[PDB]
Design a protein around this ligand. Structure first.
Ligand code: NM2
Ligand code: NM2
Ligand code: NM2
Ligand code: NM2
Ligand code: NM2
Ligand code: NM2
Ligand code: FES
Ligand code: FES
Ligand code: FES
Ligand code: FE
Ligand code: FE
Ligand code: FE
Lengths: 348, 348, 348
């Protein structure tokens, strides 16, 4: 039971990162898994993957295999991807469901709303409860053009978690509804999910790690915006609680999105999604995909993997200095302090 | 220390599988390892692998490397496959031993009864005890044409564990002594040993998982028999405590046997052995081997691997309903309840 | 908290190896990691790898990535290979450093003495401490022609740990300063570090495991010497606390050195280094390297890997007899008792 003070990182001008145990402890991870990831809205996809009846996707986060499915009735729902009879998985990959889901094991059959449609011989089983033998649901919400799930069925909506975010994202990219998935990079990353957020929250490393008429990192309520000018081309980098990042590069007509799906204390599954409105890509778009694939993302992944190894050394003396400057300049690290102050509230 | 009630699954008509912790907990596994697998008779082979003087085999179960060896004197014995000097392994694989076993490390030499024959310079070591520096034995018994070991040297015989089993197996296949190993499939299966037993104990999935003038699943004392008619061809499927299954398909002139050698809470080493009386196989027999290899066994392994993943989900709500019908029909799951009631007696 | 008596193995004539838990327990390993490996001098290299200004090497031991670097000023130093800003690793492999070390993450720049030279925007960070943001040092000492590190900065010199060793090693090989690394075999060995030492400390297995006008194994203070005659060619095998072994074969003009860098209870990284004074190898030397590579070392590695597996069996009854003879002959195992008596002093 590692603990942090309430004002941890409350003053970004004099602040340090978490004691290293928070990036490595399996007990810390189990606490964050239940207190954060099982109670927060988790972004899983852009709405375009789920726009048509019978569309489905699958996702894996904190050990939970989830199916998100647009019903025959065009209603979006989410379920745990596990049969309520004896635990076989139900669907794999993504695509179009048939009009019923059939369990591979004993062929219990479910409508796309999760209701049990047919369970062989169940009229002969004593005290069989057909309603309450349905697929088990999660909360799902379409917000800001993206799709969020929540394992806490008592949760309130995404706007309560990210006040003002949808409004500001739509003022960064006006064509979100027209975006389509152009490429996805899936990486099982050997770093704690918070190291990856840390790395996003600063541009201190842009230049020395990646070979702008002012850059402002403003904090909001459970999200932040890195904003500036590269006409007058704007760029936007949004971090949202707990760990989904939305990038709107200069031009504001496409997006990249980083989805972090934590696995354990030192492992995070990442989706890096690239979205364009074209369904047939231009050469510029194809080259951009290859550049993200071969250069930009390998740089960022090598960084977090090396940091995760290095922070375990006894020569790394507990914590690292957050290099915040008084002027909140473009190379100031103060965004890390805002993130870590929010995390600290879950370790009281 | 997870616990179960004495009457757990005592009424198969209204029964559920174990709470999921029993399929996943390393503490549950350590308890079952010592209370079940280190005290029960464990089937390891058909007698034909060990029929001649100097024949030996090796097996690995619950972390124990065991050698079973027919001596020069034609007496069957079993030992731990570890040198009593400083712990080097003694034999590997299976085949014919030489007339003494020589340790690869310092060449202590043992007769095939485990007695130390020669230990270099041991007459010069103070208080060296040559008897009690022999290989360490286990109990072994030839029963029903198969070979069983027991790590508990105070154990009584296999018949006390499986009353009536040998008598009934010989009334299923009359030629067991003439069988010879025709093929063996070795698989390290990522499922708890009890998931694999569960899967064997029901034919609810035959049809939906594997593309009969009545089928009866009768329980006995620590074993069960699935029996019916496919002349009047009979079929037999025996499960025996703790987890060896003997199949005698229609025709009753060959057998397949499933040996489960648990490794840890989520890992079980399986041998799937196919036995025919012919030493030169017919084309029907060769095709059957390839069908078991490419189709039938991959189906059954995919099932248990998916169940092991799915039962860990928080959307799998603890336990699964055992679909027993009042008529004990061929698709009734009641065999699972008998098995799990027996397991529960070890978790008091 | 496993414990051993003070006189454990104090009488080699009647002695047994550690109870098996000391070779397998992660708690025992964590204790030895902090009480032995973080407080003792650890040999890492021959001086020839570090002889010139800007020469550096890297090593990994008990989870610590260490850089040893000869400065521009020709002073030998050692540091933890981790940036003090936010934990990125600094250098990899071995070779010649540039005149400053630049962190790949945010390009903090260090002189080769570890001093911070430049940290971007640090004059704008409140209460930034530039001295105490340097690389974190370890102790390093050149002793007997080899290079030792110590994580305990209060440690005294290598001679206090190994009294008389340098003097005796120089009386085994008179040309240590002229040796150069000719080959290195790196192996991640699945055996506890003490099994590997045990194996070195006896010649009971030479002959039965590896297809001499007296052989004497004399103990000193934290090191031992295996000495004899194969003119009158001498051979020397030194073991030094905790686990570096120095071999000077007949002829006394070359050396091999075994470096053990423990990883966890059942894993040890080994360097097997072969040193000759020639920089252009003779055919005899090339063949010797290939013989060590293909025959001699695979024998010794197979032995310790099999022992590590075998000692976990319940058929290995706790401990093994150390086969010491009254005459302390060449096949006497008494060297194991001296080593294990020293280890026992850390488990009081
Ligand atoms: C507690 N905290 C994080 C504000 C300061 C810790 C002091 C240090 O960095 O060594
Ligand atoms: C926004 N920024 C500059 C901090 C990082 C960009 C994230 C990317 O998509 O990898
Ligand atoms: C205790 N038991 C297994 C008989 C019934 C458990 C109730 C349930 O299935 O939720
Ligand atoms: C007997 N039955 C039908 C439950 C399963 C057959 C087992 C097989 O050999 O794989
Ligand atoms: C305590 N000790 C190691 C000296 C003797 C242990 C007795 C035995 O080997 O069984
Ligand atoms: C010295 N001795 C004979 C015990 C072992 C030789 C070690 C070797 O270099 O592998
Ligand atoms: S596990 Fe799905 S129908 Fe049985
Ligand atoms: S370990 Fe078998 S003779 Fe030494
Ligand atoms: S981690 Fe080295 S400069 Fe930031
Ligand atoms: Fe970056
Ligand atoms: Fe089956
Ligand atoms: Fe050797």
């Amino acid at each position: 039971v590692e603990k942090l003070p309430e004002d941890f990182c409350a003053n970004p001008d004099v602040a340090w990162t978490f004691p290293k145990v928070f990036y490595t402890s399996s007990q810390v991870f189990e606490h964050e898994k239940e207190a954060i990831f099982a109670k927060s809205w988790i972004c899983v996809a852009h709405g375009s993957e789920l726009a048509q009846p019978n569309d489905y996707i699958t996702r894996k986060v904190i050990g939970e295999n989830i199916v998100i499915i647009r019903g025959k009735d065009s209603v979006l729902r989410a379920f745990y991807n596990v049969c309520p009879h004896r635990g076989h998985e139900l669907l794999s990959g993504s695509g179009k469901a048939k009009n019923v889901i059939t369990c591979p094991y004993h062929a219990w059959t479910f409508k796309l709303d999760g209701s049990l449609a047919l369970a062989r011989n169940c009229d002969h089983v004593e005290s069989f409860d057909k309603e309450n033998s349905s697929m088990v649901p999660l909360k799902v919400e379409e917000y800001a053009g993206f799709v969020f799930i929540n394992m806490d069925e008592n949760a309130t909506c995404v706007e309560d978690q990210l006040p003002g975010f949808a409004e500001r994202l739509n003022q960064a990219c006006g064509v979100i509804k027209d975006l389509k998935l152009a490429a996805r990079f899936v990486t099982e990353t050997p770093a704690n999910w918070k190291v990856i957020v840390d790395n996003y929250m600063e541009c201190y490393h842009c230049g020395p790690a990646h070979p702008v008429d002012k850059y402002w990192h403003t904090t909001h309520q459970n999200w932040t915006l890195q904003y500036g000018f590269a006409t007058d081309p704007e760029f936007h980098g949004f971090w949202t609680w707990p760990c989904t990042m939305f990038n709107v590069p200069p031009g504001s007509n496409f997006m990249t999105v980083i989805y972090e799906f934590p696995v354990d204390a030192e492992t995070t599954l990442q989706h890096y999604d690239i979205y364009f409105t074209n369904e047939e890509l231009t050469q510029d778009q194809k080259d951009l995909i290859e550049w993200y694939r071969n250069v930009f993302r390998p740089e960022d992944l090598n960084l977090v993997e090396s940091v995760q190894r290095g922070l375990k050394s006894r020569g790394y003396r507990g914590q690292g200095r957050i290099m915040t400057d008084k002027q909140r300049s473009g190379i100031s690290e103060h965004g890390i302090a805002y993130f870590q102050h929010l995390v600290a509230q879950y370790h009281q």
